[PDB]
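Example complex used in Figure S2.
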Amino acid sequence: AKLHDYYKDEVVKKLMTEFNYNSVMQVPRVEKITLNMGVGEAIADKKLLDNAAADLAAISGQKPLITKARKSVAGFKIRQGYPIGCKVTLRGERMWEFFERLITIAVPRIRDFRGLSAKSFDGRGNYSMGVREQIIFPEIDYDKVDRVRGLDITITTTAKSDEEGRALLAAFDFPFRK
Amino acid sequence: RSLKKGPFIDLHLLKKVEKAVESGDKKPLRTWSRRSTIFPNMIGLTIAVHNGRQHVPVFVTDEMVGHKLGEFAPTRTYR
Amino acid sequence: ARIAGINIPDHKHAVIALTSIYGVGKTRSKAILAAAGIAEDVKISELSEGQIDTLRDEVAKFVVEGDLRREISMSIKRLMDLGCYRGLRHRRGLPVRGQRTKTNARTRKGPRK
Amino acid sequence: MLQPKRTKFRKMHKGRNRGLAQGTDVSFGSFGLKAVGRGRLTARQIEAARRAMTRAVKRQGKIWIRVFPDKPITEKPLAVRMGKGKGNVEYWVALIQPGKVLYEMDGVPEELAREAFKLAAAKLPIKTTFVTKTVM
Amino acid sequence: DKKSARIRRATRARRKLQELGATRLVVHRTPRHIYAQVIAPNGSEVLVAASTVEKAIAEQLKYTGNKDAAAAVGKAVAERALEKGIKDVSFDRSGFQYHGRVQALADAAREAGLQF
RNA sequence: ACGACCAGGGCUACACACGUGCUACAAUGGCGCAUACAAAGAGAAGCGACCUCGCGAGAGCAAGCGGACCUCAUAAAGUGCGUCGUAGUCCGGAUUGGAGUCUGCAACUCGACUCCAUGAAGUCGGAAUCGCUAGUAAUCGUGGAUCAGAAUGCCACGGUG
RNA sequence: CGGCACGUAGCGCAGCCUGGUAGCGCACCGUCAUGGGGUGUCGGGGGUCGGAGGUUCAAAUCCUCUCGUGCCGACCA
RNA sequence: UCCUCCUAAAGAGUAACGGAGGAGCACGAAGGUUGGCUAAUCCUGGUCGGACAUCAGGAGGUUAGUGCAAUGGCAUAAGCC
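Predicted assembly (622 residues):
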């Protein structure tokens, strides 16, 4: 409940004076995150799939839900059936430990990070980020080495500009390009 | 490749500097001397180093005096 | 730790596995060991509670990792911007050592085709 | 020559004229030809027409050409007994009606414009009549 | 949108019943309130109704919507239907699933011996 | 003047092909310690000990010797141990980057050497073809000349065999 | 002209039927012999599939628009 | 032979060696029910991830989706789980 508290404490206060309104439950809060690792292919991704799964399970304390193809497949082919990604939607619980594992076990643990990007925008101003190559964690899957290291990380905060999206995520510090 | 620790300043640039401590750019400096490594006062100039055929002006930067200035003129061309 | 750069290998001598620390190599290994006053007869497997400090400390004194891999590759474009020999030779793939491109240079041109 | 590049359909019917117009006004032009009478442009008529205009108005003014031909219209070939299949598209006709604006000049005096259009016309298949720009 | 989803889930029932022609039991849930009203045979007026907001209601309630608000509307279903003697209730679920308070006040009309 | 003289370039391109060599693909081994024995040549615009300093190449200081005297010279594989364990690695060293050294006035295309890093391809080579009958082959060094300064070349000498 | 079959590496057929890969023959080109060639041992490369894209994850194929080319018929009087 | 649309003149049904296309089935779920769910397209951002896999949001409002032709019809959704 680390980041959880922080919110209800002095995140809200800080942002308040930045960005005064007539309202204070308007405030932009992080909604559920997603951790997607899209395994891809289907030639052998039913064995490859299990590894990719267990790794999302390294982070989250729950297993993920594989996603079957949506609308169209290009030169990858293989139908509108076929599971081909793995993604999981994250609890508040799962959220605050991940936020102390984003910065406590994901920036002390790095290939290299001089930031990534100043800004990100999704139409209401959310910040989505690739790690590019995934960071170690408790796992025995560094031993084995995982087919696809990196995942994506969308925050799905409820906002209206990235001009507050950043500030929100700067409160405990996600540093980015500085 | 190396310059030792005796890089050639060159004398045929020396003359240029004395005709360039009262004038900035006024010409593309007809300088046949390649083995130079020029003083800052001459940096920011179009030093026209000779490349075995005709000269070519070189808009020197500080990182083109880490090394000879000859090197920053091709003396053959490939296609 | 596993420190800067993921993995430190084990099931082998301390000096060895230290050579696998992306910018540390043959000398540079035994040089940290000499520093940190510790043996190589022992493996890294054993990871001393002393050696654990000096891991990050001595690799922090050297240009290594992202830091080095930045600077070098920043400088391949540096010269390139100035019409240097060293410069353009990188975008033809060519050497800078006066090597045989009449015959050889099959690490610069890639192999025989 | 001129036809749908991606055809909606290959063949189409005779069609009928019911005459009149609604397309009666220059919108790029300032002078123009409207129709009197009804018929078809086989588009070799549009082509001949675009040509004759250009040679006259020169590189002054600009030309637009309302109606693009959209009804195929078949011709069943020679020396075969008729009614055995529908024919093949030998044409692209442009069903035209009275008061239907053909072409459109601009940029040149009222007189030049007439005596460029008078020159085009006759390579047109019906009687024409002049358009003035009109405030509306 | 919660109000939106609700609406489309309810317009099913409010078309199958409407054809048959019944005195229906509409149940509206709300996290803190209950509305529940007994609409006309054809649907044109409400004959009798209850909610949490009656004071007649409120007395045996700790707080509004606590499901002693559906045990007080087990009483109200029992009390209001059978004043007008009605027992022709057909449960109009209103896109709510038959769980919690939904489940209640409608099992308590089975305790009132209304016809289902 | 296709003469003549100089500065720069080009002789060491390159998208390729071929020939003659060198170094590996490994534990008959590699790296680390210490340790075992040589032969034949070279030299005052020379080789250069010593001692000092340099991680080093080497530089500074300078003895000695134009020489079976002294300097090059410490032979290296080898050996006894230390290890690594058959992994593209602790193998291998290409590439490049940076840092430096030396000969020169000056190493830009076209110098070698060292230092640290980077760390290549390659896990013994189809078709084919050649060398070599003994101190040879094989492999391992050593020395010379040309050398201001660039030897996997040539030329010579021995080790094991 | 119309019917109906097929153009597929330099060149000629498979694969199409029952959507996919695109193979194979010899030639081209390189290695290797041989003094050199030819030959050949032997290594690699070569097809918008005749043009075209609608169906569809997938079109040389199936279907439709279409080009010449080959083949069958323009006959009874 | 059968189905769809147009021709077919706004009832109907309808000719041609008229204009277009399908079918000669499939399924035990793709049926039934009950409960739930809501596209296409493009924009933006986000490891591998390519213009387009997957994730998120935005715009958009069925331009989709209907086991399989075309039309009519489908958000109460018949669709989709």
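The CA atoms of residues 29 and 45 of chain B lie 8 Å apart. The longest helix of chain B spans residues 11-17.
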